[PDB]
Amino acid sequence: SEKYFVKNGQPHFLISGEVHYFRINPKLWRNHLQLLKQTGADTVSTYIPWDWHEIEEDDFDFEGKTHPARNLIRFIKLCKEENLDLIVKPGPYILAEYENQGLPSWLLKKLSKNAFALDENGNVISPDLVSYLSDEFLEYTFKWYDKVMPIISKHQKEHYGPITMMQLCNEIGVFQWLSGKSDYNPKVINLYKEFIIQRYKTIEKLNSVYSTNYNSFDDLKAPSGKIKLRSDYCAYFDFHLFFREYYNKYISILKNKIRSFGINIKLTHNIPGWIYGNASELPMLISTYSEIMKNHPDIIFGLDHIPEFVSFRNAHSDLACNKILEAMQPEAPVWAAEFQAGTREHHVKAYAKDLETFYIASLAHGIKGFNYYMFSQGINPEGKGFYGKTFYFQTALDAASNKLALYDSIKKVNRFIRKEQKDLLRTNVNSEICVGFYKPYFFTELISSQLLKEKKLNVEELGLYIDPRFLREEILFNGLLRGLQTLNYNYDVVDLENCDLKSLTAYKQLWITSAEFMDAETQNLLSEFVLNGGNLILYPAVPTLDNYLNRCEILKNNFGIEFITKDSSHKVSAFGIEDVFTAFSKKQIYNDTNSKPIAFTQENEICGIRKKIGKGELTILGFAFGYTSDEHLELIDKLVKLNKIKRELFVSDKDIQFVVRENNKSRYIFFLNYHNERKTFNYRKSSKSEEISIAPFSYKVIKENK
Amino acid sequence: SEKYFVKNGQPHFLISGEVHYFRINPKLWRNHLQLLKQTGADTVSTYIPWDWHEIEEDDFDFEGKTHPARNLIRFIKLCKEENLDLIVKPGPYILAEYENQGLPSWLLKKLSKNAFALDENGNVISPDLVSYLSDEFLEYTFKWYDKVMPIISKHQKEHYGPITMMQLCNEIGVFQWLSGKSDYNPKVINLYKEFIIQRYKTIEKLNSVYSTNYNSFDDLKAPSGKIKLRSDYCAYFDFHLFFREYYNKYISILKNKIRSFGINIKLTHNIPGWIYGNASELPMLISTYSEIMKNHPDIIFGLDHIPEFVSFRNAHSDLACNKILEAMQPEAPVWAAEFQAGTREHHVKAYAKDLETFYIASLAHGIKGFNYYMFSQGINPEGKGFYGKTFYFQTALDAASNKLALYDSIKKVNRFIRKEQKDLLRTNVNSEICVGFYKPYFFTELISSQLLKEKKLNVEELGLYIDPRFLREEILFNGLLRGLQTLNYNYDVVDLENCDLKSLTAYKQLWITSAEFMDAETQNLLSEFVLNGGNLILYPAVPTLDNYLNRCEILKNNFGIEFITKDSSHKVSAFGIEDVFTAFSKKQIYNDTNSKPIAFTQENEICGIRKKIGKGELTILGFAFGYTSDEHLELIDKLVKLNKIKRELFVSDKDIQFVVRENNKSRYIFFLNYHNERKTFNYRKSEEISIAPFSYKVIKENK
Ligand SMILES: OC[C@H]1O[C@@H](Oc2ccc(O)cc2)[C@H](O)[C@@H](O)[C@@H]1O
Ligand SMILES: OC[C@H]1O[C@@H](Oc2ccc(O)cc2)[C@H](O)[C@@H](O)[C@@H]1O
Ligand SMILES: [Ca+2]
């Protein structure tokens, strides 16, 4: 039951390369495509920039009449002649370091002020940032679609053309996020007001949930400024729910317009979130797509992976991202829409010997397809570069089509993939550990993020102590997920929203990283999980509130837990491990009733217990740890061993990472050395040892038959 | 001309290793010391924690009466028996992940509220954070000194003991930096009031500078909250000046107490500022010691270098720090008081093969001595660790004195240093480029920093557009200095404060990264520099204000410059380089009378000129660039070549870094490969070599 791309009823590993026809001498297009095809790639991918093709208002060139590199039609025909399928991405936004993020200069000069994204003061956030549902923006976007979409429709696979997939716009919300400010455009504020009225029906029902005293819906304003009251937190939480409906409305309007041209190819979107070589904020960005992914089972999201280097400093980012995409999109293959090749930034180097290891690690970490971004360097024509004349460096081909060092790395990886794809695509890893993904902890991009200008959320002003962003970044992403990968314990991630109990019962352990708040549905689901036979690990808090910070003690009551919150030293003992550094002075102190106490404060008060409940097992730790000391890995190891979970291999060097992937025919062992040390080690299957030497920042792959 | 440590009247490379006796089984103290000596190290360094030796109020154990590892006397005796010099660091603060940052629990329980650093509301900032000038704190510090300083005094080299240097406290001001919170203890604020009265004399004089409306000094309150007005900026600027005097007053009280015991050895302090493997904030921390460095020629500041890894991502950090320290401390050797060995953080790996390259790069980059921190891992006694049981990982030795991978790297590097030190220590680089260090741009630790979550400085609210922290981090540290190092052009840094004109005339170019504000003394210095024959490169602004944001147009008027500030596309052309991305829409558009236009907006307005002024040359660019594109390296290269400055070598691979260090007799060529690529190249003076990833090669040439 792996999800993978299919060609002609067989597993197909999607290998694409990004080649920007608009940034390459058209006399050299065929050579770029030939050299991409010779790496074993089956697809080529490109933006079709609106600014490049609508050269003035209502003046379109797709044929090279005004500039040879405007000859889109020729580029499509060459893709077909060179036996490559094509991914097209006509925007309206492309980003792509193209001036004005791809929008025509003539359009941005003509639009009225009310087309732009606006701050709470009514000021333009950025002269190239439109409001997505601006009437004026969508009118011109539709006139662009009227010209580019008939060309895309004509050249679809079903009409014997090369076009197999199309991206809608580009990384929806990426500008809101990087600008560090949210959109208060009056189109947006009016849709928000309709959303609130639809959700609550009467001002009395809203007031009962928020604890506000409004006389009418007319008194309610879009939340702005810092959160000081639980009522401000409630208003912002609904504002987050509203933006997820808003982005779903935007993509819905583009999709409906596209389908009217007879375009039946696969539609895609692309997920932002890596910055400075780590992806700890990507889960927040993927959370902004929650309503798109529920409403559009036919739009496949892929990841935009930008590792920059490949070391222990970022080894956990790509696996945690691939797992979280699978959790939110379990019916489609995990794929990278943009899979780092070379570097966007001259000063931020991308070494072939790093990216080659990233590519192999991505296979170990369950990737099923990717688009090398950028396969071909470009030169910006006509001053169209946002930041300088050259587009990307250290790619597979330079802009002239010369092979660079990365070319042989990509050929090596592609060769292995083509040899193995029939088995490799069908392989699974045996995960006995499931980690819960509780989307509401991620809904903070308006109030708390690595990129937001103003920190609007301070939980201590709300009488709370567990910050949801600290929890999801340090206790979950950089803590538990980093620790399991480092310890070589396989895990899966599951979305807790509308989660079937039967999709949890296959695991030996469910791990829940909990704040003081959790909705009644999720508190009930976890209660039933344990009563019915599940083994639950829960920390750092039993929640006592719902998503609106109103009382909800369902899980606490169903588990027969009594506790008080007390201050103590950061250090606790747990399972006989002394001096376990914890994030908070405040801890939950549990009554010892019908339980085994397994963690103790410096005053020897009980801050963790284990108990049997119905047919299940509960382990609660009333303290927070991520992975900032060796004791944290010893603790994760102790917790995993409570249900006798074993690693697949005994490996003599604990700093070697491995993944075993297998199906009925084939076993693949991936060894990953994320460290600057030549390592010699030995290993054997958990149920005569082989010796292996591995270079710094390198990999080995062993195939076994049966 | 070079500054360096000396032993037996000859150049001595100071090689120290940090070994915490209080964190190591005393049965193994001799084995740690023997293994340290066997790497070629000459010195061992440790804290002497106040909490560890004053076990209860007025109960001192330096002999291991109450715990074997309190036997400081025995550890000192062993250093001498094992032929190691000793650096001691008795605090009172040690940090060192030691509970309460080294202060005794009994002390923190007993101190009155007014001994603590307080927020603006009079609340204790942190239960282990004292006010440095608290009468009660200094009294207890003095009683600690009365017990530990006679021991240190007796064991000086002078008395054929091992002790050669002592550190005073530890990273003074580090807690104000990491929190972004200033101490508003009423004793501190009374000292601030005295500082302001001393500076301005009369309320009329302060009102004229600040544009305030006070009737007397009684109206004046310590600044707090966000800067909304130019008068708030002025008050915060003087609050930064005050803290530099305050730290000088604290270290002076400790120094005078220490000297009273006949302690005549070298006194040290240590400079923080690395975080996550880069050091772009460390110049801000250096700037907090301006008054100490002016008033104490005999206190040697060393750097705390924490690179974490070694690559092109952070290659420029250690050179820029070493150059800025030399600018502010020209009469002492540049040395690392804490020189990364292993890692403080289990999850933040320190590879032997990375740190070996860091140690060699540090030699290329002018370091004259260092203390491997941590040479030996520690185990925290009886939960005295702030964090877990273990102190550091991937060190040279584990806490049990097991050799680890880094041991053989340090022995290798130390063997090279000992072989070359007599000649290597006497070498300098030939810099024809001078880069100005304007300290007031750095005086922001209370209002604008990488660590400060909520920014108190927003220059747009003051009618400005060039933020001094953006300028000093992106345009200077990660832009010009990174670019010059990448291009293999030598530079020196000079402190512009009280700067001698004759020191600037050795250089072919002086580079000044300028905001809209610059004091009259510095505007006059740069005016005289050009009129006398100097070549000045000045960007992104001709300044028109002084440090209090009052009109000052001395440089503008002396150079016959006129400009209007106008908005345009971010991209400009300069010296025929198209598509140069600049930081701001706002640019200076220059009148070009008597000038040559050399940079243009997208609409061809003049945003850069060259000019002859007296006997000298002016290049003014009205736009800001760092290093974020290949065009930025092209522009720096063109600017350097305006005065015919040449690299010392032709090296066939432009991504190889080199440093040529020479004296009259000896030349060293350091080749540094900061890239994950085996590179093969050739070199010649303005021959074919292979260097591993993240590695080095050193060539000697006799002259
Ligand atoms: O690195 C921050 C983000 O950077 C984005 O790139 C940009 C590059 C330039 C720009 O002006 C805005 C965005 C990527 O598309 C996204 O995947 C990534 O998460
Ligand atoms: O990494 C930030 C700083 O961390 C400092 O260590 C500390 C870490 C935490 C803390 O609360 C106090 C000090 C280092 O001594 C200093 O050199 C460094 O620049
Ligand atoms: Ca003039």
Summarize the structure in short.
Chain A is of the alpha/beta class and 706 residues long. The first copy, chain A, is globular. The complex binds ligand 7OQ (2 copies) and calcium ion.
Structure description:
The structure is a homodimer. The first copy, chain A, has 706 residues and is of the alpha/beta class. Chain A folds into 3 domains: 6-424, Alpha-Beta Barrel (TIM Barrel), CATH 3.20.20; 433-641, Class I glutamine amidotransferase (GATase) domain (Rossmann fold); 649-705, Immunoglobulin-like (Sandwich), CATH 2.60.40.1180. Chain A contains 18 helices and 31 strands. Chain A has a 9-stranded mixed beta sheet. In chain A, α13 (352-364) links the parallel β11 and β12 (369-373). In chain A, α13 (352-364) runs parallel beside α14. At the A-B interface, α13, β21 and α18 of A face α13, β21 and α19 of B. The complex binds ligand 7OQ (2 copies) and calcium ion. Residues 95, 97, 171, 174, 178, 272-275, 304, 306 of chain A line the site of one ligand 7OQ.
Tell me what the CATH architecture of the largest domain in chain A is: Alpha-Beta Barrel
Helix proportion of residues of chain A, in percent?
Answer: 25-40%
CATH topology of the largest domain in chain A: TIM Barrel
- CATH homologous superfamily (4th level) name of the largest domain in chain A: Glycosidases
Shape of chain A: globular
**Number of DSSP helical runs of chain A:** 18
Name the ligand types: the ligand OC[C@H]1O[C@@H](Oc2ccc(O)cc2)[C@H](O)[C@@H](O)[C@@H]1O, calcium ion
Q: Please outline the major beta sheet of chain A.
A: 9 strands, mixed
Number of strands of chain A: 31
Query: How do the strands of the widest beta sheet of chain A line up side by side?
Result: 16-15-17-18-25-24-23-20-21
- Going by helix content, strand content and strand pairing, the class of chain A is alpha/beta
Name the beta content range of chain A.
15-25%
Largest interface: A-B, 44 and 43 residues
Taking the alpha carbons of the first and last residues of chain A, their distance comes to: 19 Å
CATH level 1 class label of the largest domain in chain A: Alpha Beta
Number of domains of chain A: 3
Q: Regarding quaternary structure, how should these chains be classified?
A: homodimer
Based on CA atoms alone, the radius of gyration of chain A comes out at: 26 Å
InterPro entries (chain A): Class_I_gatase-like (IPR029062), GLMA-like_second (IPR054746), Gly_Hdrlase_35_cat (IPR031330), Glycoside_Hdrlase_35 (IPR001944), Glycoside_hydrolase_SF (IPR017853)
Organism (chain A): Ignavibacterium album (strain DSM 19864 / JCM 16511 / NBRC 101810 / Mat9-16)
Keywords (chain A): Cytoplasm, Glycosyltransferase, Transferase
Subunit structure (chain A): Homidimer.
